[PDB]
A paper describes a structure:
The controller protein of the type II restriction–modification (RM) system Esp1396I binds to three distinct DNA operator sequences upstream of the methyltransferase and endonuclease genes in order to regulate their expression. The plasmid-borne type II RM system Esp1396I has been well studied both in vitro and in vivo and reveals a temporal control mechanism that employs a controller protein (C-protein) encoded within the RM operon. The controller protein C.Esp1396I, and indeed all other C-proteins studied to date, have been shown to be homodimeric helix–turn–helix proteins that bind to pseudo-symmetrical DNA operator sequences.
The only clear contacts between the C-­protein and the DNA occur between the protein side chains and the phosphate groups in the DNA backbone. The bend in the DNA is centred at the TATA sequence between the C-boxes, as observed in other C-protein complexes.
Numbering used by the authors:
A (entry chain B): 2 to 76
B (entry chain A): 3 to 77
The structure:
DNA sequence: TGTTGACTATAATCACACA
DNA sequence: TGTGTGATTATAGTCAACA
C-alpha cells in the first residue's frame, strides 16, 4: 500500500535536488502548484501521467532518463 | 498528448502478449472495463496507483514494463 | 424488458520488417 | 531463414438510450 508511487515520488525529489532546484522552482517551471509538488514528494497526492510529463519538463530531463533512473531506484 | 499515449500502447501490448481481453485485465486489476477501455482509446488521465494495478493483473514487474516502455520511446 | 444504433474490441489474414 | 509488428477487413462485442 505504498510502492511505485513512493518510488516515483522519490526520484523526482532526487533529481530536483541534484539539479539544485526548489519546490517553488519546480512548480513554476512545470506550470503546477507548490502545494501540489510538496504533497507528492511526501506521498500525499495521487499523481497522474500527464502531471508527471510536466514534471520531467520542469526538471529538464527526458522521459527515457527518468524511467532508466526509476528502474535503478527500485532495485 | 504524448506520454499517456505511449504508456497506453504498452498496456494493450502486454495484454495482447499475455493473451487476455480487456475484461480479463479489468478483473485481474480490479478496475472497471470502461476505464481499461478508456486508457486504451487514449485516454483517461490515468493515475500511478491505477497503473500499478494494471501491472499486477498483467503478471509483469514494473522494471520489465518501463524497459518495454523505453524501447517503445526510442525512434 | 426487448431491441435499435453507433461505437468498440476481437479475430483471421497478409506482407514486410527486423534478427 | 525465422519471428514479429503493422495494417487490413470483418465479425462480434459493448453500452446507452428509448416505448
Amino acid at each position: 500500500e505504498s510502492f511505485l508511487l513512493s518510488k516515483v515520488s522519490f526520484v523526482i525529489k532526487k533529481i530536483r535536488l541534484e539539479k539544485g532546484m526548489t519546490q517553488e522552482d519546480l512548480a513554476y517551471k512545470s506550470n503546477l502548484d507548490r502545494t501540489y509538488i510538496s504533497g507528492i514528494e511526501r506521498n500525499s497526492r495521487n499523481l497522474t501521467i500527464k502531471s508527471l510529463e510536466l514534471i520531467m519538463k520542469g526538471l529538464e530531463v527526458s522521459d527515457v532518463v527518468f524511467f532508466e533512473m526509476l528502474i535503478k531506484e527500485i532495485l
